[PDB]
Amino acid sequence: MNIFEMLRIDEGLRLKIYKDTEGYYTIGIGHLLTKSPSLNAAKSELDKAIGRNTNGVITKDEAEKLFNQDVDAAVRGILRNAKLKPVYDSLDAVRRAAAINMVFQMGETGVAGFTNSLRMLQQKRWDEAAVNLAKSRWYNQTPNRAKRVITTFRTGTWDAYKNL
Numbered sequence: 001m002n003i004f005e006m007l008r009i010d011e012g013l014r015l016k017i018y019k020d021t022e023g024y025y026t027i028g029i030g031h032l033l034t035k036s037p038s039l040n041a042a043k044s045e046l047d048k049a050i051g052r053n054t055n056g057v058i059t060k061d062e063a064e065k066l067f068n069q070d071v072d073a074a075v076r077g078i079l080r081n082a083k084l085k086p087v088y089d090s091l092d093a094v095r096r097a098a099a100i101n102m103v104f105q106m107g108e109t110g111v112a113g114f115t116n117s118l119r120m121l122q123q124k125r126w127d128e129a130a131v132n133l134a135k136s137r138w139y140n141q142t143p144n145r146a147k148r149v150i151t152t153f154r155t156g157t158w159d160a161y162k163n164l
Contacts (some may be wrong), residue, residue, distance in 0.1 A: 005161070010145050012029070014027065028062070075100060084099075087118045091121065095121070102149060114136070114152075122134055126153065
């Protein structure tokens, strides 16, 4: 297990434009295209991202290219953020994957808002952090995925990603 495999499990792979859990146009391995309700706007974003005129459909290789870029962008977003970077630096490699997963799903700004959870993570108060993380819109809207990510923060193991 590693961050790519983890996010591939959590996001799936679809080669045609689809709507994500929030109803937003997305493609590939959780590549958000736009929050606009316009499918035409989403297609335009897709074409710009891929560099060709698609039919709203991409190849697996194209999906994986966007995915690589998106994982890189999430890591970059953490390292450039004054609140997230010190917490990330304090973590072991498994928990760092959980951190990247959160930022991939909700973005740098959204995750930087988990102030109290972040403090508990930096303090290595794992059970307390896990309880705090669950008191969130995130957990309520995507509980199974959040439970997996939270278990990863709680334990520093990949146990929530074994079997599935």
